Amino acid sequence: AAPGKPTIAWGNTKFAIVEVDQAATAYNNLVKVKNAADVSVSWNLWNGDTGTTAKILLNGKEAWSGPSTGSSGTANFKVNKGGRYQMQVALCNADGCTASDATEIVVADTDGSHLAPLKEPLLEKNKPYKQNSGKVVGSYFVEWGVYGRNFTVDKIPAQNLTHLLYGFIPICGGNGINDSLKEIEGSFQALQRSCQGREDFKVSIHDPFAALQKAQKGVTAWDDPYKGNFGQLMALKQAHPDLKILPSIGGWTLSDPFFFMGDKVKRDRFVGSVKEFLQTWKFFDGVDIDWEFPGGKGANPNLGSPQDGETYVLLMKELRAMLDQLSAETGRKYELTSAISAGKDKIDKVAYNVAQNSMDHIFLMSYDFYGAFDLKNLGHQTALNAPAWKPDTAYTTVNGVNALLTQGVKPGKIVVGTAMYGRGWTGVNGYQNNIPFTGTATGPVKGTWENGIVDYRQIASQFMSGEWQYTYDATAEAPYVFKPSTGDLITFDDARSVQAKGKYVLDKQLGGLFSWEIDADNGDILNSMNASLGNSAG
Numbered sequence: 001a002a003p004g005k006p007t008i009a010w011g012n013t014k015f016a017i018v019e020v021d022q023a024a025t026a027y028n029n030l031v032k033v034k035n036a037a038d039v040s041v042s043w044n045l046w047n048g049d050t051g052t053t054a055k056i057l058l059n060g061k062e063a064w065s066g067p068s069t070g071s072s073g074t075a076n077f078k079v080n081k082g083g084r085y086q087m088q089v090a091l092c093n094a095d096g097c098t099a100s101d102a103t104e105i106v107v108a109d110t111d112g113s114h115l116a117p118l119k120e121p122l123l124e125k126n127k128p129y130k131q132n133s134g135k136v137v138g139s140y141f142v143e144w145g146v147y148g149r150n151f152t153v154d155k156i157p158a159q160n161l162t163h164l165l166y167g168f169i170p171i172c173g174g175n176g177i178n179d180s181l182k183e184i185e186g187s188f189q190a191l192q193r194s195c196q197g198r199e200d201f202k203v204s205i206h207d208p209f210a211a212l213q214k215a216q217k218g219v220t221a222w223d224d225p226y227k228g229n230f231g232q233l234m235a236l237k238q239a240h241p242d243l244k245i246l247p248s249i250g251g252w253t254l255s256d257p258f259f260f261m262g263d264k265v266k267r268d269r270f271v272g273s274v275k276e277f278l279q280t281w282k283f284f285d286g287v288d289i290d291w292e293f294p295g296g297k298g299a300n301p302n303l304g305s306p307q308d309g310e311t312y313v314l315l316m317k318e319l320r321a322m323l324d325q326l327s328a329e330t331g332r333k334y335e336l337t338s339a340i341s342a343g344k345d346k347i348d349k350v351a352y353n354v355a356q357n358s359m360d361h362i363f364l365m366s367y368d369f370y371g372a373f374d375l376k377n378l379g380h381q382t383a384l385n386a387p388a389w390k391p392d393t394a395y396t397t398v399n400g401v402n403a404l405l406t407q408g409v410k411p412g413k414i415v416v417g418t419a420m421y422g423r424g425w426t427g428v429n430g431y432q433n434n435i436p437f438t439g440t441a442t443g444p445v446k447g448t449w450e451n452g453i454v455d456y457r458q459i460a461s462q463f464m465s466g467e468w469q470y471t472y473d474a475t476a477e478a479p480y481v482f483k484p485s486t487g488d489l490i491t492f493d494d495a496r497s498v499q500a501k502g503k504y505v506l507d508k509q510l511g512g513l514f515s516w517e518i519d520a521d522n523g524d525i526l527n528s529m530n531a532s533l534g535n536s537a538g
């Protein structure tokens, strides 16, 4: 007689190759990379002979075997590839093998190979597009948007993007290194806790709870090895294998450490830590560098040096050489990109015609041209062109594109930015010829989340009725709303200015469009990016 049929013992079924320690706040303790998951299976034999060999099978294939020595047994073995496996215990003797019923086990890896695909329906006004224009359609998802903004990875209209940027991955450093974070309550202290025992100038995760642990759709079971934004991005990657998901390093409040990378010791340490970050988190497809800005004039008034352009070029070159190596080891295509000032004065601090040789795309931040940071000089915050009243306006999309083109940047590298938010002023007064921009303001407009800034969702839903005047400036390619009684003025992108930008990209053979930030759109802005770049509906 063959052995009796074993019964798998109840026990944990989810294991991880990269493990997240559930009680640690320092990135170095939080994340344990192993060569393989340590899997454990037990069984009982309730009827028959226990056989002479016990085997654990994963989809029929032996991962462990040993002597079958009693009515119950335990196998501890390593599994080096992620997935969901039909596991069985089989008991064998000379007369045959008898296999248990299959139990599914999870062997988690950060490519999301153990996860069901996160395929969610489009929400709000989002309509389906195919990505067939061959142009970039990008947007940023922000890590902290899962809190007050309540906008999670399952709400991303992912089929409508080619590029999804994760803002932001910080670089470790305390006093003197990340001083700009101190302007945000608790933010500098959160980074120091995350970076404790970790060298300055290495990357980390700013909010490991939101990134890895917060229950979210598809990752709510307590034993799920990855949860939060990363666990959902892994599952999104299963649903959208051609979507490029890039970690964005820097941004407004996390750019200070770039200013030190003229020291090759620090720069080498940074690049090596980026490599390790991509080996650890396999769902990411490259790296986006958002250094605001070489030369300074970013958040920190004390940083910026004439050397920064040279540092930037060297950095892009070294990141490229690291990515070409990773790409060789893995067989994957990795991308290197950068979000950059669209102001000619910042553009001319960098030789982009040299750095473009290392880079896949340049995200031109053709927005924030004007806003409540200047109450005196009012203007269109994200316009294509100068307006009729001031044809020599410095800060326009076209002036940034032409600055790059004049350096000798190739048109196909350049991705034009659109805003999914408005900036505005209150108390605008002293304007002439019915153009509020010719006046001056007394303060910022009341914002959705902070003063002077309104989600595109709120503009469309609250500010396109009642007393609000609406004008589309067809010279600048720029809409604006104005409430004269309070003097509230908001400058923003809408479906039409986005269509102008998209048409311009096609005419000038540029690379495509990107937007900041995805949670703020109701679908109008992203629908228009897709349509205007010539993506097919459906």
Ligand SMILES: CC(=O)N[C@H]1[C@H](O[C@H]2[C@H](O)[C@H]3N=C(C)S[C@H]3O[C@@H]2CO)O[C@H](CO)[C@@H](O)[C@@H]1O
Pocket: 140, 167, 168, 248, 250, 251, 252, 253, 254, 290, 339, 365, 368, 421, 453, 516, 517
């Ligand atoms: C209006 C807003 O959302 N402000 C954010 C800020 O967003 C910057 C961003 O850092 C900069 N980087 C890009 C990439 S696009 C570009 O513009 C946006 C909007 O002006 O980000 C910081 C953190 O860097 C937040 O504190 C702030 O909420």
